[PDB]
Each structure stands twice: as C-alpha cells, then as structure tokens.
Amino acid sequence: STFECLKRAWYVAAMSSEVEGEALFHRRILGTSVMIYRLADGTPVAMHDRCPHRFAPLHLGQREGDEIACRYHALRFDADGRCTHNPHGNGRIPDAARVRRFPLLERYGFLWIWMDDSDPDPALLPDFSPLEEGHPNAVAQTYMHMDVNYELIIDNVMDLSHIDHVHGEIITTRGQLSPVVPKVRERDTHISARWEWSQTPAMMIFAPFLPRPEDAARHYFDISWTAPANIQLSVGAVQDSDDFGDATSQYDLHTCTPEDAFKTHYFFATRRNHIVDDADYNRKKIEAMHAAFETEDGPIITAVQEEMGEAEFFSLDPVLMSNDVAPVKVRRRLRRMIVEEQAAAAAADAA
Amino acid sequence: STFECLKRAWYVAAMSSEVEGEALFHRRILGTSVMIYRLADGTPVAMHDRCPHRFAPLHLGQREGDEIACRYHALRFDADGRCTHNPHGNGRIPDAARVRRFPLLERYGFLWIWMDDSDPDPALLPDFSPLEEGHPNAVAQTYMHMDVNYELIIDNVMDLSHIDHVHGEIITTRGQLSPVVPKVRERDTHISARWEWSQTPAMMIFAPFLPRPEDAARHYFDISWTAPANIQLSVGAVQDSDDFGDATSQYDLHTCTPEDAFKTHYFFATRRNHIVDDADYNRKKIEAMHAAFETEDGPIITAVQEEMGEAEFFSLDPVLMSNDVAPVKVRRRLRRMIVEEQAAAAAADAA
Amino acid sequence: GSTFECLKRAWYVAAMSSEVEGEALFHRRILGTSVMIYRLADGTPVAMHDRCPHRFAPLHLGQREGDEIACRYHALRFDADGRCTHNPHGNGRIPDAARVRRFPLLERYGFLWIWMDDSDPDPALLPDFSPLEEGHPNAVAQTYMHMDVNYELIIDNVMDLSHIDHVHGEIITTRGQLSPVVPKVRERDTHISARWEWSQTPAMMIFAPFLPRPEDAARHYFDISWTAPANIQLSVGAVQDSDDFGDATSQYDLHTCTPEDAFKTHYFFATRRNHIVDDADYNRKKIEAMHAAFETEDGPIITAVQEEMGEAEFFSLDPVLMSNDVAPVKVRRRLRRMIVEEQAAAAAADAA
C-alpha cells in the first residue's frame, strides 16, 4: 500500500500570482518535481523539473528568453521541452534530450495541471467561473502547505460543525451550526451539502456590512465537492429579508493537490459580493482568512494526522455521526473513482 | 518486528508533581498516546489521548469540570471515558464513542499505569513504601527523557562499576567499586545485588554529614530489580561502627517506562535519612542528582544506543565479564517473563 | 540501493594528516563502519573499530592512557593493536574475546589512507601521488568537505569539467571555452586519463595574477587520471607566449572520495601549486578560496541532483549521455566491473 491519487483530473499546481514572468517557479506535485515559468506572451509552461542529462533540477538553471539552460552542463530546452542547444563537443543534440511537458489550464486565478500520461481533457476542469466574474478586488487567492494527506483537509471542509469550537472571532458560529442537520445530495457531477441557521452577532467576516452589525442574521453554507479535491463553499448573511438574495455573501473555492501521501498543497480563493472595488480591504480579508485556516484549522488537522500515523482513516474504525455523512460519501466516491480509473487504465491499455 | 514489553505490570507514567489539577497532561507510553488529569477531589485519571470520532488528541481539547471536550467537534467524555454529550444533529451519543481508560495507582510520588486490556492487579505494584514514610523534604522525584531502549538504562544501573570512571565529584567512587565482586541473588520476586567497599573521602553526596568528612568511610550498594523496569538502590556511608545501621544513607528508586522501542521515560526518586526537614537542601540535592544522570550517564548510554543501532544486545555478541552477571540475569528474567506472558495469552486464546 | 557495494581491497582517505592532533581521539564513519584514529608518542597513527566489545560504547568517548585507550563506560584498556591490556573488574582476568579490530593505515600525500577489507594490506595498491610530498611545504595544502550524496556523483562531476563554464563563479570560471573542447581520453590497466586543452581571456583567476600579463589571454591544460577506488589527480595551469606548457603557472591537485554510507561521502582535496611556493599566508588564502568554490558552487548542484535522483542507480534512470560524458562513464563501468570481479574471487576463494 503505496498511496494512489486520481491521475486524469486537474489539480491546482500554483496561484496565478506565484509565477512572476522571469521567475523559474518549482513545486512537488503528486510526488513529481515540476518547474513552471511564463513566456514573453504571458503563456504559462509546466515541465518535469529534471534535466534528462544527469538529472539536475532545471529551476536551478538560468533562463534564456523563452528557453531554460540547466545550471550543470547548460543544455537549453524550449517550452515544448525539446533540447534547442548542446554546447559540448561536436554540438549534435541527442533525440533523447527531452523534458516531459504538463498540460496547464489558467482559470479562476490558478494554474491547473494534468499530470497523467494521457492527452488532457479540458472538459474535466470544473466550472468555478463566478470567481472570474466581477470587479477584480473582490476575488483574492491564498496558499497554505500542510504536512498531512489531502483527504484530511477535504473531510474538515465537508464537516463545518468544527467552526463552532475550533475557530476564533474572525469566523466563529458560536455553537449554532453544530445542531443543524444539513441537506446533502449525491449527484453524477458533484456531492452538495447545505447548512442554514441564525446567530447573534452575525459572523465577523460579514457583520459590519449588515444593516445592524450587533443584531442577529440568517446564514447559509452551500458547498459541493468535485473530483479530485475541489469544494466550492458559498456563504453569507441576510437581515430582515427571507430571500437570501440580499445577503452580504461570498463565493469560495477550497482545492487540494497532494505533494505526496502525507503532504498537501491547500489553495483557497474567496470572491466577496460587498465593497467590490476596495483592494486595500481585499488584502486585509484574504490575509485574515489565511490566518484563520493556517493558525486555527492547520494545527488540529496536523495534530490528527500525527495521532493517526500512516494508517488509513476508515481502518482505525472512526465513530462516525450526524455531521460525518457528506465527508464519508466524498471519501467513498473518490475511492470508487480511483479504482474505476485504475480499471480503465488497463482497459485504455487494451482500448 | 515491533518490539515486545511486559503488559500486566505497573510502569511509572508521570511524577505526581506533573499533573496540576486543571492541567491536561499528555505523554506517549508503550507506543500509546495517554492523557492524564485530576478531578475536583484530586483523583487522577488516565485515558487514550485520542477522540474516537476523527482521532484528534483530547489534551488539545478544552476541560469542562470533570469532563474533557475534544477541540475539533466538541464530543465530551467523563473520567470513565464514555461520551457524556454530542452537540451535533439529533444529539444521540453512540455507545461506541468511548476512550479506553488506563488503571492508575498513585504511590511513591508517581502515577503508576496498567496498560494491558485485562483488569489491574494492584498486588503486582511492588512495595517501595519507605519513600512514603518520614518528613516529606527527604523524599524528592526527578524525570529524564533519553532517546534509547529502556533495557540500556536498567543495564547501566545494575553494573554500578561505571561510577568509578563515568561520573564526576558529586558521586564518584574513585576506582574502588570496580574491583569488588558483588553478592547477587535471583529470587521469585526480585533480583538483588550488593556491593560493599571503602574509599577516602566518602562519596560527596554523604561526606559532609559524616563524623569526619575528609576521612575514609565503608559504603554499601544494595539494589533489587523488580518487573518491568524498577530498581530500588539503597546506599550510604558509616564511619567507626561495623553495624551499617548508623550510616548517612538513602532509599532510591530508578524506574523506566518505554515511550517506544528506542525512547525511554526514566524516573528517579531519592529519600535521604539525614537533615530530613531541610527542603532548601532537598531541591539542591535532587537537582544535583538529575545533573549527574542527565549530563554524565545520559550521553554515554545515548552514544552506545547509536553505535548499537537497532540490533538486539545479545545478538551483537557482547564480551560480558565479572560486573555483567546481575544485568544479564535481569535481561533474561524480563525476556523469560515476556515470553511466559505471551504463552498464556495464546493458551487462554485456546482455553 | 540496499545492496550498496564498494571496492573493499583498496586504500580510501580516512582523514587529512592535520585532523589527528597527537593526544586527540579522532572518530569518523567510513564504509558504514565507526572508526577511531589517534597518534602514539612517536607520531605513529593507529586506526580501530570505534566500539568497545564489552557493551558497544564508542572508544573515542573514552579517556587516553599513554599509547592505550580506556573506554569511558567500564574502563577496559586497549593497545594500538586493539587487544585488551587491563580489566579493572572482579578477579581482573582479561577475556581473549576483548579485542578491537585494527585497520591498516598508510600516511602519504598529507592523508591517512585506510584498508577496510578483512585481508592483509597491499601497499602496492596505494597509487603514486608523490609530487604532493615534493617541494616547499607551503605550496601543498589539504581541505575536507562532507556532502550528503553517493561518492560516484562527485567523481562524475570532476570527470566532466565542462560544468566549470556555467556552474562556477570568478575564482576558477573558464567562461564558456572548456565546454566545446572534445577531450583526449585513454582507458589503461592502472588509470583512466582525460586531457582538455584550450585558451581564454583573462586566464583563470587562480593563475592570472602570476602570469606575464594578467588581463591578456593564456593557453590552459586539464590532465586528470582516475585510479580505484575514487582518486582523481587533476593537473592544471596557464602558459603565456611559450608553446611549451613547461613554463605554465601550474598546480598538482588530488580529488579523492571515501563513502560514509550509500548517500553520504567524505570528499578530500589537496592542491600543490608551483608558484610563490614559500608564502603560507597566501597558501591558506588559496586552499580556503578553493574549498569555497567546491562547497558553495559544486556542493549544492551535486546534492540537488542526488535529491532529484532519489535512491535509484544512475544508469537505471536512462541518462542522456553525450560528448563530455565518455570519461565519467568508463570510470563508473570500470569501478563496477572491479567490484563484481572482487566479489567473484571472494565467493570462489570461499570455495577454492
């Protein structure tokens, strides 16, 4: 039992912000060294961060326009990862001098990566388009690395009861979310779950922008898991009105991307519907969001991972309850999908 | 191989001092996460530091009178480790929401713990009662953690020749202990070993309280090993008299408690017979004792462990000698006891 | 890999002569073995398994007693031959079994060479790097670097010196001129040689100030030769005006490695310069600025590579080998062939 992830699907490799034109970005993804850089025309490129000569990482190399020269013996490679120049001996450039390229897709303020040996299926990139709609200082992205298996983070985000007791002022729901039985639906595309409640005051994240900050407000959490590790939490607070349409609301995306078995690249994006222009505040939010996850959620999930050791979640006979229905359905669906994928790996080997 | 310790015996889990009423003490014991806390009435309680919901440690949780709520999703548990409250959904609390409780015994200024699945046998807690007798500022406890297998520490304490060459002024025996062949007895309860000698000056630990500090003094080391890792070193210096009865003496307990294979919780307790009242000195002793073990014994035993690697002591064909008779008898008895225990486990599995 | 195999019947550099300070008890891990070294009264260096056979305490931690070592635990003493000279316990009788295994040493070229194999030593096999031992003693100097890599990655670097164009900064940079040169390489029964010649402007900083015109162009030569198990004897220098390299501001180096285990390596270097031979004030300033170049510029790439390679055997990963990789392959293969040939006549002398 060496670890198995879904291969076919689109994982978030990096925030759009993390590749600064000239910069040679490197990151480990599904246990693979990956280099990224942009070209002249902004076009992002992903390669195996590994020169095929003596296996030196390429990110350590020097950039040469839209080509990378490896820092060891200076073989250059183009964006397609064929060798453009050998400066040794006769000069002849071996057919074998190729870096494998990773199909990228730059939507929702992230670089999505296709790791599998097959051709990409841009179809499978799920539709989180509302992030791309509206004044650009409402949408913002943060990254957190955590030394845990990805499915522990998903499980946290799918069981939002935790917010009552885990989290401090910034988003605390004050014991009110826990008692609510959520409406959960399995579908062919996604797995949804909706919590509704009310508290006093409203969650600090929304309260100041409400009609009466101090006073009570109805809240809604609609989430949906999509393969391999994406969850699109929509949240907000209405006062007075029954129609949630007026709510001081928000479109979030929690996505994970495993580094290996027990490390995980955890990306978050908000897009708020309130004071949409103010980038001075947008930074102050997304910083105070990252804070909440990294400082309050981070340590519990990591603590759990340590107490769990390497042993598979269900193997430890967890005492599952009212609030664990959604996060199980996920783990099982993902499990079923992984086996189904391994099947039609050996069946696409035939066909 | 996982290593094998004796179950169905009392290991020291913590000094009585280490559990401060309100405090949620945590410690790893025989490769098990263990929480301890006191109740209103002082009563110490031991539980598997692991909420059975999602395997969050409970020590991280918030305390609620004589109950602990897990900091993740706030399931509460009583001292018996049955769940007293689920704040989610309908509210129903599964029978299955149980943390395993560890029988404790608070004698000799330690919390003794019974790790095995069976009912405790307080019979087996050996009788170190003289610690509990007398003015409370003669008795004192210290703890040292060392990154070694427990049987390496026992072996050190059973072969006290080492004090001649290992230790500095505080307790040095000046080459006089080494040449003595000790009287050793294997017994049904214990394994005893007695060194007698004389040196000049007396061991610094006793010398000032003797008739003539500078002058020679007869010394005695009576030790007895009891299962699983307890050694009850009695020591002292007489001058003039033949009868050791007058000696500036002391009742020590070396006990170990493995964290896992190659880590060990090493607890020590002195109880001196001299200037029994003076707690100002008692601290100055037990500090200068810990010093000697941690700074002089500590580094050799840890160095050895590294040089030994993972390989079983006897497997390395050690060149055993005059002074290694006691520490072998121990290792063998403990080995025999462990196998004998595993036998009647597999034979009560049949019968 | 878990069947990590080195050549046994050969001389590895255990330590720089400088690293054993008479009284001092030097310790070092060599071919996965704890090893103690110390000198005697008469300077004579001694190597032992750093491990008291009583309770397996390391001996280096012990206290020294003239030309004997007492183990710090229970004070069994041992002579330079590693037989026990004294038991201070019980009756006093010293068991035949109380022995430390001794490692044959050879103190040449400013290093302590060690013979790890169970056989008797063959001083024959210690290759001849004698020019280090010749000349004013402030031209010769030694440095040590530890790197968290398999030894054959370091050898491979030193045998493919093209890297100096792009890897290294000012102190030795060859400015893109070395790479295009196809070197003359020869396999031989003793060694594997390889010679690069070229010219650049300025000359390599290491030589330029001592040349006729520092700023002006100079012909350079790199003659190297690999000898088993991990020794490479890099000769380098710069001539101006003359065709005859005989006049060159030159140098005799030795790169040698000595594996700690699979993926750690003791890397020793010795220069011996032919210029301003007396000035020890400068000699230190050179050998420091040499160590710098290897540790700070070479070190991080070779370690980075090792990480990217993981544990997997070099050739197994299908490396894209080229004009400049001919020498470093011939080496790896020769060393490989030698190791198997050695293991063969071990299992065949086990039979007959």
Ligand code: FES
């Ligand atoms: S490995 Fe990059 S060119 Fe040598």
Ligand code: FES
């Ligand atoms: S994990 Fe124990 S509170 Fe849910």
Ligand code: FES
């Ligand atoms: S272990 Fe070396 S003297 Fe006891």
Ligand SMILES: [Fe+3]
């Ligand atoms: Fe001691």
Ligand SMILES: [Fe+3]
């Ligand atoms: Fe180099």
